[PDB]
């Protein structure tokens, strides 16, 4: 019922920070608002021209919007929201290096391919019920760090997550926290 207003939340956030400037901050902390932020407004967000790390985690956001008008965004943190679809990210695709989106309701990775510069993708505890999404995900030439722990597909996997994950993507260097291992690579080869 429109409980949370970004401007309202933003005003409180700006006041709490007490920073003179609405858009000077490199890390804008909008996480854990009480009541939760529901749906973000692109126009309000647009003023955050200096932001390299946008923290919107622990809210009740249902969708993704207002990608455009963002110029320095490198880390987009949206974990523990109500998001179902990866979309509306073209506006930050040129700069976005990390997407943190664990504890949401994402079952399809369609649309992730736009984040051509993505290096880190954290998406624990989402839905994900097929390695089909990974093939789409692979097109990410810079992806090095991936987190899938908690996903439904992993549960149906019935095999060690760390090994299979390494096998699935050559590009990833770290999977569910773990560093590349010679032994791990050998195990993957055996598998």
């Amino acid at each position: 019922s429109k409980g949370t207003t970004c401007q309202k939340a933003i005003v409180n956030w700006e006041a709490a920070n007490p920073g003179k400037n609405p858009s000077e901050a490199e890390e804008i902390k909008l996480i854990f608002q009480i009541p939760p932020i529901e749906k973000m407004d692109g126009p309000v967000l647009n003023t955050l021209t200096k932001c390299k790390k946008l923290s919107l985690s622990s809210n009740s956001i249902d969708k993704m919007i207002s990608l455009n008008m963002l110029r320095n965004l490198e880390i987009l943190s949206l974990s523990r929201n109500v998001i179902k679809k990866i979309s509306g990210l073209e506006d930050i695709g040129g700069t976005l290096r990390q997407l943190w989106l664990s504890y949401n309701f994402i079952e399809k990775l369609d649309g992730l391919n736009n984040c051509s510069v993505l290096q880190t993708l954290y998406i624990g505890n989402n839905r994900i019920k097929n390695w089909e999404e990974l093939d789409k995900l692979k097109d990410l030439p810079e992806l090095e760090n991936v987190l899938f722990y908690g996903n439904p597909i992993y549960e149906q996997v019935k095999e060690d997550p760390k090994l299979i994950v390494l096998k699935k993507l050559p590009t990833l260097k770290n999977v569910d926290g773990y560093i590349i291992d010679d032994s791990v690579l050998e195990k993957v080869k055996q598998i």
Binding site: W13, Q33, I34, I37, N59, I75, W100, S102, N151, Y178
Partner: protein, 192 residues
């Protein structure tokens, strides 16, 4: 003589920056002990709790953001929760509908929390947890966390410990990288 003067200036800058880097490296060690030290003690209490309070749930959400699995989402199924004896309504994303049940069922939860990849930027996770950080004082406060349950305070500390460790690691790499570039230039100058 010009090379020697440049080397001396580089060395003074290197020493001050090295002292900053050394402080950061102890801060990182303390942060690593904080989450690693909690072991499964906090996890056992969370499993034992079964149906935790909304304030306790918020601490779990921060841990869930790092996990990046089935995170709840721009406010669906989110309502204002009363805090302590104060009738205050605060807007939030709310706890994950079914992410906790799947995480609780897995016996690798201790294995998941116990091992974390080092030097992880977590830019996507920090942006997601950025809103939580501004409101952290209201529900992630240690006094507030301890009041709901002993285990809830540890989980919030566990989530907080990892964030502090990540910030320390970023400073250690970047400020350390500037010091390192200066040191490399100084080393080339020294060979010359």
């Amino acid at each position: 003589k010009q090379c020697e003067i440049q080397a001396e200036q580089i060395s003074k800058e290197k020493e001050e920056a090295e002292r900053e880097l050394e402080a950061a490296l102890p801060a990182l060690r303390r942060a690593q002990e904080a989450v690693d030290s909690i072991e499964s003690k906090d996890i056992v209490e969370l499993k034992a709790n079964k149906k935790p309070l909304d304030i306790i749930k918020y601490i779990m959400d921060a841990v869930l953001v790092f996990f990046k699995a089935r995170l709840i989402p721009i406010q669906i199924e989110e309502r204002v929760f009363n805090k302590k004896e104060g009738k205050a309504v605060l807007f939030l994303k709310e706890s994950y509908d079914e992410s906790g049940i799947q995480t609780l069922g897995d016996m690798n939860f201790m294995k998941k929390l116990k091992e974390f990849e080092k030097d992880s930027i977590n830019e996507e996770t920090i942006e997601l947890l950025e809103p939580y950080l501004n409101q952290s004082e209201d529900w992630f406060n240690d006094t507030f966390a301890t009041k709901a349950s002993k285990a809830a305070a540890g989980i919030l500390k566990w989530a907080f410990a990892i964030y502090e460790y990540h910030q320390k690691s970023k400073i250690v790499k970047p400020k350390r990288i500037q010091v390192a570039i200066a040191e490399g230039r100084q080393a080339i100058a020294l060979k010359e």
